[PDB]
Amino acid sequence: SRPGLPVEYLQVPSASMGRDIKVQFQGGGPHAVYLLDGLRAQDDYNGWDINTPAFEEYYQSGLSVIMPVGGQSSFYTDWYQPSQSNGQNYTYKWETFLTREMPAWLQANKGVSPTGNAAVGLAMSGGSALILAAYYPQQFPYAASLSGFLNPSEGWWPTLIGLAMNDSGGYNANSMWGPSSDPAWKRNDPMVQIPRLVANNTRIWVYCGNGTPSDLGGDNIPAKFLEGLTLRTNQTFRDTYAADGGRNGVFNFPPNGTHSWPYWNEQLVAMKADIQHVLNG
Numbered sequence: 001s002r003p004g005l006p007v008e009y010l011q012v013p014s015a016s017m018g019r020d021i022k023v024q025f026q027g028g029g030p031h032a033v034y035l036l037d038g039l040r041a042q043d044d045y046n047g048w049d050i051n052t053p054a055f056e057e058y059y060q061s062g063l064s065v066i067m068p069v070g071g072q073s074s075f076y077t078d079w080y081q082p083s084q085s086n087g088q089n090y091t092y093k094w095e096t097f098l099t100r101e102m103p104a105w106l107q108a109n110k111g112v113s114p115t116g117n118a119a120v121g122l123a124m125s126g127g128s129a130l131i132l133a134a135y136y137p138q139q140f141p142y143a144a145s146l147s148g149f150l151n152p153s154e155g156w157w158p159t160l161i162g163l164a165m166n167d168s169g170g171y172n173a174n175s176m177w178g179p180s181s182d183p184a185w186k187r188n189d190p191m192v193q194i195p196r197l198v199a200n201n202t203r204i205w206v207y208c209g210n211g212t213p214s215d216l217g218g219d220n221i222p223a224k225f226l227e228g229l230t231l232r233t234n235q236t237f238r239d240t241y242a243a244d245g246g247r248n249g250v251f252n253f254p255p256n257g258t259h260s261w262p263y264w265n266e267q268l269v270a271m272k273a274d275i276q277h278v279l280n281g
């Protein structure tokens with residue numbers, strides 16, 4: 001990162017996962033932007049730090065920046081069981097980590113507020129961000145989804161998500177939310193949870209690109225299909241939000257936008273003033 005940036009790397013114990021979770025962190029205010037990674041999340045650095053100047057862009061913004069590290073194919077959710085076939089030796093509990101363990105550690109050690117924050121996700125974690133806002137409104141009054149999979153329980157989505165998770169580290173969607181008919185699928189479906197976002201008055205920022213090249217993952221899915229379905233589902237989400245009385249959203253579907261880190265970063269920059277005004281202001 002740019003010289004002079006007070007960027008830290010932390011080891012935050014997760015009791016629920018029985019291991020330490022690495023977290024990249026920049027201070028600068030009591031409230032924070034949680035920057036969530038995609039399907040191919042690595043164990044060294046969060047994709048936002050690898051691919052974008054996020055820390056530099058939010059330096060001296062009055063907001064802290066939190067980039068959890070790890071959780072390949074996790075959907076930032078609490079799984080039913082260890083991923084069956086790839087030999088995972090514990091159960092992912094990333095919702096517990098993000099909503100309890102991590103904010104408790106950051107509050108106790110640094111004074112970061114557990115409440116009044118923003119969740120910003122892309123691709124895999126676009127839906128995660130909205131789900132976090134749906135069920136933890138005090139923690140996340142603001143959520144952004146950038147090229148997110150916003151109707152994971154519908155139609156071919158469980159199949160596509162299963163394919164993409166397998167293509168990213170051999171993870172099993174069935175171990176995560178059960179068979180596609182299990183209640184966990186709808187529970188974690190932003191489209192289904194729109195009325196929670198409306199009643200919570202969540203400030204939502206929803207971007208979606210189209211075409212190629214793509215950083216969505218799921219490269220094992222026939223060319224162009226995931227990229228187009230992601231757009232169509234985002235458009236349906238947009239229409240449904242309005243139909244359900246939603247009145248606190250920004251929807252950015254620029255025709256030249258792609259599902260790629262450069263556009264996701266452009267959106268992160270574009271929403272900065274928006275987050276500042278909503279969270280601080």
Ligand SMILES: OC[C@H]1O[C@H](O)[C@@H](O)[C@@H](O)[C@@H]1O
Nearest residue numbers: 099100103104107114115139
């Ligand atoms: O996400 C934050 C959670 O953990 C914090 O430690 C609690 O103080 C509370 O603010 C919340 O239950």
